[PDB]
Amino acid sequence: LSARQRRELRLFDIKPEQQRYSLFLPLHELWKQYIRDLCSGLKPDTQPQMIQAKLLKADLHGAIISVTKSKCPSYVGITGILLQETKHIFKIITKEDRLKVIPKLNCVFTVETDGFISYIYGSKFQLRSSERSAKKFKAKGTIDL
Amino acid sequence: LVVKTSLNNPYIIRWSALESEDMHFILQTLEDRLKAIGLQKIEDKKKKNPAHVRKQLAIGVNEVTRALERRELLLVLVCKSVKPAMITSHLIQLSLSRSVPACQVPRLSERIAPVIGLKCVLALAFKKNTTDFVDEVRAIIPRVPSLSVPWLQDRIEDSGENLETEPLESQDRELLDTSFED
Amino acid sequence: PVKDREAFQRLNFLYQAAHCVLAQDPENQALARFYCYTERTIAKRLVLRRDPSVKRTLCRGCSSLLVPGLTCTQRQRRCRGQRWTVQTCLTCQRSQRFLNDPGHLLWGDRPEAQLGSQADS
RNA sequence: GUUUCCGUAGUGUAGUGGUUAUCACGUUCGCCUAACACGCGAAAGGUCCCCGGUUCGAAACCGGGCGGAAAC
RNA sequence: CUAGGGCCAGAGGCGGCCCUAACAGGGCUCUCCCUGAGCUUCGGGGAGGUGAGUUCCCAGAGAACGGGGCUCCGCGCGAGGUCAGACUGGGCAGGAGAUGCCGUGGACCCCGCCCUUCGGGGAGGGGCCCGGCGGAUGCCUCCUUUGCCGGAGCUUGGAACAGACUCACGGCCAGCGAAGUGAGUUCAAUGGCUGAGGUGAGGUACCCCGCAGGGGACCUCAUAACCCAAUUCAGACUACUCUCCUCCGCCCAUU
Numbered sequence: 077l078s079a080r081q082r083r084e085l086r087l088f089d090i091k092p093e094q095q096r097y098s099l100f101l102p103l104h105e106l107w108k109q110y111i112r113d114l115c116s117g118l119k120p121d122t123q124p125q126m127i128q129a130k131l132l133k134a135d136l137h138g139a140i141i142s143v144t145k146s147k148c149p150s151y152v153g154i155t156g157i158l159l160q161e162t163k164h165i166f167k168i169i170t171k172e173d174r175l176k177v178i179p180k181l182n183c184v185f186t187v188e189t190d191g192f193i194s195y196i197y198g199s200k201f202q203l204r205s206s207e208r209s210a211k212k213f214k215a216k217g218t219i220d221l
Numbered sequence: 222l223v224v225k226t227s228l229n230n231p232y233i234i235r236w237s238a239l240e241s242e243d244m245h246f247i248l249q250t251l252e253d254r255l256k257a258i259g260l261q262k263i264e265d266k267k268k269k270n271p272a273h274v275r276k277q278l279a280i281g282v283n284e285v286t287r288a289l290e291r292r293e294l295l296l297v298l299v300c301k302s303v304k305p306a307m308i309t310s311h312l313i314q315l316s317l318s319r320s321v322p323a324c325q326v327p328r329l330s331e332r333i334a335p336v337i338g339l340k341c342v343l344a345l346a347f348k349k350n351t352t353d354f355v356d357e358v359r360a361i362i363p364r365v366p367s368l369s370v371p372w373l374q375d376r377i378e379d380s381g382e383n384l385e386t387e388p389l390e391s392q393d394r395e396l397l398d399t400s401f402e403d
Numbered sequence: 404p405v406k407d408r409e410a411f412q413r414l415n416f417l418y419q420a421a422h423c424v425l426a427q428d429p430e431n432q433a434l435a436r437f438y439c440y441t442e443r444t445i446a447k448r449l450v451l452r453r454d455p456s457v458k459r460t461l462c463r464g465c466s467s468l469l470v471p472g473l474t475c476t477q478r479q480r481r482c483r484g485q486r487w488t489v490q491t492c493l494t495c496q497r498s499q500r501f502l503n504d505p506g507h508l509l510w511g512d513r514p515e516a517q518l519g520s521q522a523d524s
Numbered sequence: 525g526u527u528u529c530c531g532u533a534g535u536g537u538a539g540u541g542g543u544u545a546u547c548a549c550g551u552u553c554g555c556c557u558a559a560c561a562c563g564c565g566a567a568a569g570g571u572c573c574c575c576g577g578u579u580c581g582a583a584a585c586c587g588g589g590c591g592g593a594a595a596c
Numbered sequence: 597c598u599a600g601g602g603c604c605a606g607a608g609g610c611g612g613c614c615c616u617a618a619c620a621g622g623g624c625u626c627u628c629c630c631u632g633a634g635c636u637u638c639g640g641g642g643a644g645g646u647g648a649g650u651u652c653c654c655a656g657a658g659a660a661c662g663g664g665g666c667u668c669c670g671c672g673c674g675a676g677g678u679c680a681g682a683c684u685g686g687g688c689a690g691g692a693g694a695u696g697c698c699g700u701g702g703a704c705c706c707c708g709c710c711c712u713u714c715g716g717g718g719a720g721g722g723g724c725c726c727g728g729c730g731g732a733u734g735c736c737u738c739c740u741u742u743g744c745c746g747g748a749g750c751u752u753g754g755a756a757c758a759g760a761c762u763c764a765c766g767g768c769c770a771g772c773g774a775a776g777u778g779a780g781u782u783c784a785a786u787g788g789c790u791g792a793g794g795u796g797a798g799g800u801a802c803c804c805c806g807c808a809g810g811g812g813a814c815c816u817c818a819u820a821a822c823c824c825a826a827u828u829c830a831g832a833c834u835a836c837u838c839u840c841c842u843c844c845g846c847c848c849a850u851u
């Protein structure tokens with residue numbers, strides 16, 4: 077059950093790397109209508125503390141990210157939507173076809189909503205993101221970036 | 222009060238339009254073509270003592286499911302005589318790639334018996350690549366209604382999502398089943 | 404269903420996101436496997452009772468929600484008594500038994516069609 | 525050096541031999557009174573010390589990390 | 597006071613092996629589960645034996661067994677026709693899959709080779725299931741059906757030759773008040789300063805060897821964090837970086 081689910085891997089191949097990244101936009105279009113169906117109130121004045129709290133447990137698969145701070149200078153400035161989301165890494169695909177892996181070690185990601193911009197500090201958000209929606213996101217420490 | 226919230230999503234992938242005025246006389250057109258050309262299908266199987274045998278008439282359920290897999294342009298004819306047939310006929314809706322899934326519900330069960338053939342066939346299809354059998358049947362294919370599938374994409378970059386949460390109640394099955402274990 | 408109401412949106416989103424990958428580009432199914440593996444894990448820890456109509460397509464060996472419906476083999480055959488509709492993928496080679504018969508349409512309407520007439524608001 | 529026990533709304537504490545978070549005090553409101561102390565109903569208020577692991581699901585079970593307390 | 601020991605009931609002893617009287621020790625190795633950015637022959641964590649017990653609500657034939665729900669089947673029982681093959685006659689099964697075939701699938705039955713002569717281990721075949729490919733005849737020869745008995749399946753579910761957890765795999769019996777630990781304090785000593793080095797960066801109008809190179813000399817700077825002996829030692833676990841060794845990942849840039 078452990079090695080039998082891990083025969084080859086669940087990892088990508090060489091041929092899906094060139095799948096014409098603008099065709100991954102309906103995956104972002106599905107996520108864009110998902111956020112409007114989640115809170116269903118955006119415009120006049122509707123609780124910015126609620127928006128950043130519902131995105132704690134929200135499955136952010138297929139969302140645009142842009143690195144505005146990282147400990148590595150080479151990681152900063154990479155844009156694209158994400159496909160996989162592992163323990164402390166998540167694989168993104170960028171502009172004209174090439175995929176990149178950015179670890180969730182000490183960095184923050186910028187997620188652009190319709191009328192909101194939310195930073196996600198990737199040093200606390202780890203540990204198998206299916207379990208992130210479950211339990212145990214408590215208040216610990218600061219993020220010195 | 223025992224109420225269990227159950228995420229129940231049978232998103233109804235509907236069939237073609239129920240045009241009883243349109244889908245009645247086209248089946249009589251199929252009886253005019255399958256009888257006037259020849260009825261040598263049973264004469265080679267029973268051998269009551271070969272050109273009509275060369276067709277790839279997909280007879281049965283499992284010959285239609287293998288037909289739409291590789292690369293085949295054909296026509297699908299599905300009747301409804303079984304009430305849990307949605308388990309079987311889900312492959313007809315979901316394999317919409319290069320075919321037209323026609324679904325004659327009330328009359329297709331009465332179309333096997335007047336033709337000199339076999340017992341009641343559920344799924345009817347035929348492979349007719351690179352062979353001109355009847356040019357008039359190929360004109361009925363743009364005339365029969367097609368079915369849209371909002372399950373995957375429905376051909377347009379616009380997704381269709383719903384929130385179908387049906388709360389299961391234990392008191393409803395307590396009056397129907399009346400089963401107790403202590 | 405106050406706090407658990409948020410959890411229903413996170414399960415059917417990743418279910419639908421695996422369909423959007425295979426609708427545009429088939430034969431590359433690594434996104435459909437991980438979106439089903441995350442869907443099963445959230446339902447495993449945050450306990451929800453999903454319907455057997457969808458769950459019989461997830462192919463509970465590892466993960467494939469749409470792969471046996473358009474690529475693998477699902478046929479009808481008769482093993483011993485009544486006929487069975489065998490759903491078997493091409494990755495873990497597991498099968499799921501489902502019998503199709505007109506004699507048990509009353510029992511075939513028992514798990515799925517009884518909640519369509521009893522689950523009231 | 526030594527041993528055992530404990531961490532639960534604001535405090536004092538139950539409870540659980542694993543799937544629900546609460547009783548007493550106090551606050552708010554309500555019952556009552558010309559306006560009251562009691563009685564009584566109800567609501568606001570949860571990092572169940574922290575992480576990992578087992579399990580379908582740990583306030584609980586296990587492992588580790590602290591913390592606190594009782595006495596020679 | 598040798599606990600490399602004895603006593604009563606037992607007769608069972610935690611995958612196997614190896615090292616140690618330091619067995620909640622370590623190493624090698626097999627199987628399974630959980631899980632991780634080295635496709636994975638990978639790293640890390642946990643569990644292996646036997647017996648007993650437990651395992652929410654709902655759904656479901658069934659969550660210990662049996663009964664009961666429904667279908668299929670006849671080396672069983674009973675009735676009717678006896679008109680018991682007629683032009684292979686009759687009836688049944690069959691696209692809602694009959695027949696045929698494939699296989700490092702079975703914890704199934706049997707033949708059965710070898711290691712062996714207790715359970716058994718592996719190569720191979722038949723029958724019965726499982727799964728896959730491919731689509732037309734096949735079955736019985738007085739016949740048909742009900743009831744009873746037995747066998748098999750049963751859309752559930754986190755789970756149905758299961759898995760997980762708890763308990764049990766023994767109980768009980770042996771000490772010396774006498775000076776002074778390569779630190780030995782106990783109202784609880786001790787990791788000091790300066791100077792010169794080592795190693796790790798940086799520099800040279802300096803010297804020698806003459807292969808553009810190298811070595812020496814001199815000068816500047818880093819040397820820490822975690823933390824504190826209280827009888828001592830071995831081992832596991834946990835908190836760590838001035839550092840060295842092994843194994844790699846991601847991204848940038850170059851060819």
Ligand SMILES: [Zn+2]
Pocket residue numbers: 462464465466467492493494495496
């Ligand atoms: Zn599979």
